[PDB]
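Database export, one record per block. Field names are fixed; values are copied verbatim from the stored entry.
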Amino acid sequence: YSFKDTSTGHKNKEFVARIKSKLDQGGVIQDFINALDQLSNPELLFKDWSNDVRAELAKTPVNKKNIEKMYERMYAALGDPKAPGLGAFRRKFIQTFGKEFDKHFGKGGSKLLRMKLSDFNDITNMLLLKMNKDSKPPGNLKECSPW
């Protein structure tokens, strides 16, 4: 959405909103979506948002809003207890990246300050290696994917 505030923009916004409401009653579509998301992609999603953060870190510190919007992705993906989807290897990865995340990459979420230098690729790489090795294929039983 890019709905500017002008009256045309506002009425358009309302029309789109009523569409968004009306369709997907029950949101079972959103449920299917979210489910196959979290249980679909391997942790290399970490690599994905990591080099996205890498690109975005070259920007000025006023990019902290985008930095938070990129943190919230992985946070809702992993850190939140009883996260939506409740993945199997997702649970394994968040269990393997609890206090380890707090120590290095998030500081509980308070890592948002240190946007000046971009060396964190080192932490990314050391994580990504050890998760690449001894990695697990998603379970042949889609019971690996609970929903």
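Remark 1: The longest helix spans residues 7-22.
Remark 2: The helical segments are 7-22, 28-38, 45-57, 64-79, 88-96, 99-103, 121-132.
End of record.
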